[PDB]
Amino acid sequence: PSWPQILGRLTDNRDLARGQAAWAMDQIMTGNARPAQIAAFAVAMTMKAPTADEVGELAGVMLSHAHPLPADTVPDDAVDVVGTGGDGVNTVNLSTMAAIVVAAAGVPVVKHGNRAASSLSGGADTLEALGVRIDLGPDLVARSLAEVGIGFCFAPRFHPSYRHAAAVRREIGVPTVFNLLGPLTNPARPRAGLIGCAFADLAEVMAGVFAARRSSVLVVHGDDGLDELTTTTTSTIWRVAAGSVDKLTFDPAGFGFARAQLDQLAGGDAQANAAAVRAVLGGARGPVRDAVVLNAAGAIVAHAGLSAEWLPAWEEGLRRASAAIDTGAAEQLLARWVRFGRQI
């Protein structure tokens, strides 16, 4: 393989041959690709329309180069709650709040996360503002998971070889196929997840990648644009179970949720978003709580799918998420997580 061969195939609007996307990603990850070649590749794949085979190859290479967690430290039923970002709506950190609630409900959570790219505060920024240690290595993330019930894998910490691609992504600004990779590259390789996708046209491709590795995942795109399950309107869900993908539309009104306005989910800086987390975990009722409970429930549904029915699953997920907040378990879990980090 060579860059002219691969780039020419893509600019001819052709799918790549098996192995070519992987070759390309490996050149990028080993520091062997010129910034121009990285940019050409990211753009050309995006404009061709990436296939699940192609995106799976890219994610596979990233996972090969990533720092793994220690053997036998990640429960077989661990779940992720993470999105692509890039929805261009400055919301509170819904996945991060959902993940705390899910862990408090007793589902092991290994969250893949990062600082902001286009927003004012990313999940990692907000966790740091809450006093949680974001920058732990493999051994300590495994300890966090075992001791607290949740671990946070900071993407730059676990994927140092991605630094060459990350730099090009910033210079060009435009979203590309690379924006799909964060949720597909959790170094703990959890088999379940609630996965947000800001890009309606690419959510099915993400779902195809998860289907190929036989994950139990709900890939979600709010019909208002959010890379979360929204409360302002319906959401599209690509449901991944038993190696296949089912496209569904989801309406929170079927579970008694009132419609919110997008303004009601608005975020601010890390300090403001930390305050918002504290408010929800402390039992504040209102729009943000509703969105957190909904997303926590979706992750619990994904976790359930590792084994059945859609409606009892949602009912159970919503019951469990709501109780995790109401009993104070979620608030207490955050306190315990903070304490864990301060004790080395």
Ligand X SMILES: O=P(O)(O)OC[C@H]1O[C@H](OP(=O)(O)OP(=O)(O)O)[C@H](O)[C@@H]1O
Residue ranges binding ligand X (CB under 6 A): 82-83, 85-87, 93-96, 113-114, 116-119, 122-123, 182, 196
Q: Of 159, 153, 204, whose CA–CA distance to 65 is shortest?
A: 159
Q: Count of residues binding ligand 14F (CB under 6 A)?
A: 8
Is residue 46 a contact residue for its own copies (CB under 8 A)?
Answer: yes
Contact present, 148 and 333 (Cβ < 8 Å)? yes
Binding flag, residue 114, ligand 14F (CB under 6 A): yes
By CB under 8 A, tell whether 190 contacts its own copies.
Answer: no
Assess 126 for contact with Mg ion (CB under 5 A): no
Q: Is 328 annotated as a binding residue?
A: no
Q: In what order do the strands lie in the sheet with 244-250?
A: 150-154, 109-113, 79-83, 192-196, 216-222, 235-241, 244-250
Between CA 163 and CA 268 the distance in angstroms is 27
Collapsed DSSP state (helix, strand, coil) of residue 66: coil
- In Å, how far are 43, 141, 225, 292 from 154, measured between CA atoms? 26, 10, 25, 21
Of 11 and 261, the one with the shorter C-beta distance to its own copies is 11
Partner whose binding site includes residue 80, from its own copies, ligand X, Mg ion, none (CB under 5 to 8 Å by kind) = none
Does 94 count as an annotated binding residue?
A: yes
Whether residue 144 is annotated as binding a ligand: the answer is: no
Task: Round to whole Å and give the CA distance between 318 and 300.
Answer: 8
User: Residue 154, interface with ligand 14F (CB under 6 A)?
Assistant: no
Q: What is the DSSP letter of 256?
A: T
38 binds its own copies (CB under 8 A): yes
159 touches 62 (CB < 8 A): yes
**Of the two residues 50 and 123, which places its CB atom closer to ligand X in the complex?**
123
- Is 254 among the annotated ligand-binding positions? no
46 is in an annotated binding site: no
* 163 near ligand 14F (CB under 6 A): yes
Cβ nearer to its own copies, comparing 180 with 276? 180
**36 near its own copies, rule: CB under 8 A:** yes
Angle at 206 between CA 321 and CA 47, to 5 degrees: 140
93 annotated as a binding-site residue: yes
Q: Which of residues 73-112 bind Mg ion (CB under 5 A)?
A: 83, 95
Is 113 annotated as a binding-site member? yes
Contact between 316 and 119 under an 8 Å Cβ cutoff? The reply is no
* Residue 247 marked ligand-binding: no
13 contributes a contact to its own copies by CB under 8 A: yes
Q: How far is the CB of 160 from ligand 14F (least distance, A)?
A: 5
Q: Are 103 and 150 in contact (CB under 8 A)?
A: yes
Query: What pairs with residue 152 in β-bridges?
Result: 111
Helix (H, G, I), strand (E, B) or coil at 80: strand
26 exposed, middle or buried (CB, 10 Å; 0-12, 13-18, 19+)? buried
Binding region for Mg ion (CB under 5 A): 83, 95, 196, 227-228
Contacting positions for ligand 14F (CB under 6 A): 114, 155-156, 159-160, 162-163, 166
Q: What residues form the annotated binding site for 5-phospho-alpha-D-ribose 1-diphosphate?
A: 83, 86-87, 91, 93-96, 111-119, 123
